């Protein structure tokens, strides 16, 4: 199924994922697409964070769901 | 000018559909970066809407 | 990009800079306006002390960002 990952820059990344996909794997795909380390990848859905040890079915994520990718840093 | 600060907050408001906009606009003047604001929101920088 | 440098007095100065600009040049720009020696110009960005021989991109400074200008007196 198709999902829409939105960034703080206003970018809408379209990724191909399935219910059996893992949240960690999704972040890995984004790392290959934009080049953002998993440490700086915070996936938020409806205001809550998704655990890496969960699937899209665990959060009842259906088709055309919008994923909020929160950018971050720990430098200063 | 608050032209960029407001714009940045507007985007954050779409990422977190549960945070008060007036508060996001406030942090934007203290952090001045969406990379810090949005992240710090999860940490506990901005006071979440608690029934009071 | 335009940045906002706030002095200890509360005064705010808007400067025209770019990521490719150096911190030292920023001091020269402030010196050209306010007439404050670059040696007494201690620029701090959210806690990060800006080094003269550094680029604005090295501190990831964006537009409408507020910078702190601390004045140094009595010292070598």
Swiss-Prot record, chains A, C:
Q: Where is the Ubiquitin-like domain?
A: 1-76
Instruction: Pinpoint the Glycyl lysine isopeptide (Gly-Lys) (interchain with K-? in acceptor proteins) cross-link.
Output: 76
Sites marked Essential for function: 68
Q: At which residues is the cross-link Glycyl lysine isopeptide (Lys-Gly) (interchain with G-Cter in ubiquitin) found?
A: 6, 11, 27, 29, 33, 48, 63
Disulfide bond entries: none
- Residue(s) carrying (Microbial infection) ADP-ribosylthreonine: 66
- What effect on the protein does mutating residue 65 to D have, as reported in its record? Phosphomimetic mutant that binds and activates PRKN
* Effect ascribed to mutating residue 72 to K: No effect on ADP-ribosylation
Q: Which domain of life is it from?
A: Eukaryota
Which residue positions does ADP-ribosylglycine occur at? Answer: 76
Q: What is the effect of changing residue 68 to G?
A: Loss of DTX3L-mediated polyubiquitination of histone H3 and H4
Compartment(s): Cytoplasm; Nucleus; Mitochondrion outer membrane
Q: Please describe, based on the UniProt annotation, the reported consequence of changing residue 65 to A.
A: Prevents phosphorylation in case of mitophagy. Decreased localization of PRKN to mitochondria
Bilayer topology reads:
Peripheral membrane protein
Where along the sequence does the record put site: Interacts with activating enzyme?
54, 72
Q: Which residues carry this modification: Phosphoserine?
A: 65
Function of this protein?
Exists either covalently attached to another protein, or free (unanchored). When covalently bound, it is conjugated to target proteins via an isopeptide bond either as a monomer (monoubiquitin), a polymer linked via different Lys residues of the ubiquitin (polyubiquitin chains) or a linear polymer linked via the initiator Met of the ubiquitin (linear polyubiquitin chains).
Q: What is this protein called?
A: Ubiquitin
Its gene name is UBC
UniProtKB/Swiss-Prot annotation, chain B:
What is the associated disease? Spastic paraplegia 89, autosomal recessive: A form of spastic paraplegia, a neurodegenerative disorder characterized by a slow, gradual, progressive weakness and spasticity of the lower limbs. Rate of progression and the severity of symptoms are quite variable. Initial symptoms may include difficulty with balance, weakness and stiffness in the legs, muscle spasms, and dragging the toes when walking. In some forms of the disorder, bladder symptoms (such as incontinence) may appear, or weakness and stiffness may spread to other parts of the body.
- Could you say which residues of the full protein are shown? 453 to 504 of 643
General function of this protein: E3 ubiquitin-protein ligase that mediates the polyubiquitination of lysine and cysteine residues on target proteins, such as CD3D, CYP3A4, CFTR, INSIG1, SOAT2/ACAT2 and APOB for proteasomal degradation. Component of a VCP/p97-AMFR/gp78 complex that participates in the final step of endoplasmic reticulum-associated degradation (ERAD). The VCP/p97-AMFR/gp78 complex is involved in the sterol-accelerated ERAD degradation of HMGCR through binding to the HMGCR-INSIG1 complex at the ER membrane.
Instruction: Return the domain comment text from this UniProt entry.
Output: The CUE domain is required for recognition of misfolded proteins such as mutant CFTR. The VCP/p97-interacting motif (VIM) is sufficient for binding VCP/p97 to form a complex capable of transferring VCP/p97 from the cytosol to microsomes.
Q: Which organism is it from?
A: Homo sapiens
* Ranges where the CUE domain occurs: 4-46
**Where is it localised?**
Endoplasmic reticulum membrane
What does its PTM field state?
Answer: Palmitoylation of the RING-type zing finger by ZDHHC6 promotes localization to the peripheral endoplasmic reticulum.
Please spell out the taxonomic lineage of the organism that makes this protein: Eukaryota, Metazoa, Chordata, Craniata, Vertebrata
Summed up, the tissue specificity of this protein is: Widely expressed.
Could you tell me what this protein is called?
Answer: E3 ubiquitin-protein ligase AMFR
